[PDB]
């Protein structure tokens, strides 16, 4: 039961993530997570980034996972779980445009 309410929602896709952040949720710099329906069932890291020239928006970072145990959105860095990686990304982005949720859903 990771944060289940900050940088990870559960088994969501990229369509619900884009309308989940823009449709009442948080400002930019908010990176949530969710299971990617692109592969058998990988993970994901949606992001919120509004702009002063079009409106709000939302990107995504498909998260992968080593069979040996290594959660990594980019092969440059993996971890043991999503709570442990949200722990490391909490202090750093890891390489993506922005790190996990910046503010606090609270």
């Amino acid at each position: 039961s990771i944060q289940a309410e900050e940088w990870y929602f559960g088994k969501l896709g990229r369509k619900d993530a884009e309308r989940q952040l823009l449709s009442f949720g948080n400002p930019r710099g908010t990176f949530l997570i969710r299971e990617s329906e692109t592969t058998k069932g990988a993970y994901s890291l949606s992001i919120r980034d509004w702009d002063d020239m079009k409106g709000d928006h939302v990107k995504h970072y498909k998260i992968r996972k080593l069979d040996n145990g290594g959660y990594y959105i980019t092969t440059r860095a993996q971890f043991e779980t999503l709570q442990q990686l949200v722990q490391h990304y909490s202090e750093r982005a890891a390489g993506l445009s922005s790190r996990l949720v910046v503010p606090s859903h609270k």
């Binding site: 692109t38 390489g95 993506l96």
Partner: peptide, 11 residues
């Protein structure tokens, strides 16, 4: 048709 941004690492 990109489905996700993959952090690169080339020169």
């Amino acid at each position: 048709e990109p489905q996700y941004e993959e952090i690169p690492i080339y020169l």
